[model samples]
Target: PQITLWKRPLVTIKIGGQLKEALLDTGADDTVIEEMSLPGRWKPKMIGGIGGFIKVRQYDQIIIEIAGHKAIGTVLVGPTPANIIGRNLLTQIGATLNF
Candidate 1:
């Protein structure tokens, strides 16, 4: 009998300067924002998109940590289920996912 092991390289990033866990997703076209995890005293602009971006204000900052990976960025406060790890993040880490 033999055991198979699987592992992947992870990175950490500052979502609001606080530490958190971010999942890696390659199917995303843009970096999804989390309103609840924004930084302290930070301001966000109304980034217009095809989906129509809404103006956001400052809140909390949740530092995303995944094993040894991380990232620091502002979360556009809005309505969403949860923050999603997207293309911008993947590119920053110089990675590509083939499925």
Candidate 2:
């Protein structure tokens, strides 16, 4: 199946049994979520964005459903303005540039 890229390419995703809308960001290296509760210890990391830098918790082995396609990848939780689905999960979903 092929997915057309919208202006932001937003899609519905489920993480930790919760449904949320996320932006499909090909430019991002990893997926970043606004916030979520998990039952594990995570490492602290700094991520630089267009604005500046932010401290985030890196959680590994997270399962997420993107547009009904399930994939396992690392998910970052922080004070992000929006949830993002990056290339890690995108590749698993067989996403590609069709133009």
Candidate 3:
């Protein structure tokens, strides 16, 4: 399915046994999700959005199914304003931004 830029590219994604809706953000370099009780030892990381930076828990080798497409990468957990699936995973899902 094709999506236009007029609207936010929000889509359903599966993480482990959890289902969630996140924004397929092209502008974000990393994936940021709402705080969930994820299993694993995470490292502390900082992400700087359009406004500034925030501290987050970084879990590597995490798998997420975006629109039925799967990507194995790092997923950052934080109290984010929104759940954003960024280029780190988007590229693995073969997503592209086009006009």
Candidate 4:
């Protein structure tokens, strides 16, 4: 049986001394991750979604390095296929998607 790798290799960064994969998502306004997966201080807010964004919170300030470039910013916590790499990250590094 082939075990499925939930995280795809998009980009990577060291968080709390561990390297984590970053997924590229166009829909996402900013990058986000699972609350339990990250460790740090983040603010809580009422996010409006189909069922109402509901009360959500997680560590915001996180460091991410993509293709060798690094960044520090706040990210939301949610169940996603992978951590997203947003336009903020791309613009900061002046990057253009190849695909």
Candidate 5:
């Protein structure tokens, strides 16, 4: 299945057994989610973005469902304006750039 690219390419996905909306960002190397309570241990790390560097919790082996496709990947929990679905999960979902 192909996803039509919107202005933001926003899509609804399930993460940690919860439904959440996320932006599909092909440029990003990893998925980043807004801060929330999640099980498991995370290693402290810093990530750089257009807004500059910010501390993030790297959580491994996260399962997410996109467009009915189930994908397991890394999810970074941090102070993000919106949840982002990066290349890590995008590739698993067979996502492609329309533009």
Candidate 6:
């Protein structure tokens, strides 16, 4: 699929059997979700950005669905300003980024 990049490359993704609005961000190293309870053992982790460092929790092998595609990827849960799907999840989708 050809994804024409514009002002916002935002799309809907499914997680924990629910639909959420998140944007595709290549700059981020991993996938993150809004702070919530997930079923599983999670490890405490830290997140860094241009702003600074933040505390978050990491979970493994969570299903993320996008455009009918699925990915069992690591998820970071915290006080994320926005539900974001990053480079980690992008690799699982077949969509292409065009100039």
Q: How many clashes in each structure?
A: 17, 0, 0, 3, 0, 0
TM-score of each: 0.46, 0.92, 0.93, 0.60, 0.89, 0.89
Which model is ahead, 1 or 6, in terms of lDDT?
Answer: 6
lDDT score of residue 24 within candidate 4: 57
Residues 1-99, candidate 5: write the lDDT tens digits.
566754777888888878998888988998999988678888988888898988889988888998678999888999987789999999998887765
Instruction: List residue ranges in candidate 6 displaced over 4 A.
Output: none
Candidate 3: tens digits of C-alpha lDDT, residues 1-99: 789878888999999689999999988899999889778899999999778988999999998999999889999999799999988998998888677
Report residue 74 deviation for candidate 3 (angstroms): 0.2
| Tens-digit lDDT track of model 6 for 1-99 | 556675777778888878888878888888889977677999999999878878899999898887667887899999888788887888888545655
- Candidate 1 TM-score, true structure as reference: 0.46
Q: How does candidate 4 fare on TM-score?
A: 0.60
Clashing pairs in 4: 47-53, 48-53, 49-53
What order do candidates take by lDDT, descending?
3, 2, 5, 6, 4, 1
Identify the leading candidate in terms of lDDT: 3
TM-score quality measure for candidate 3: 0.93
Model 3 residue pairs with clashes: none
Least accurate 10 contiguous residues by lDDT in model 1: 1-10
Per-residue error for 35 in candidate 1, Å, reads: 1.6
RMSD (CA, angstroms), candidate 6:
1.4
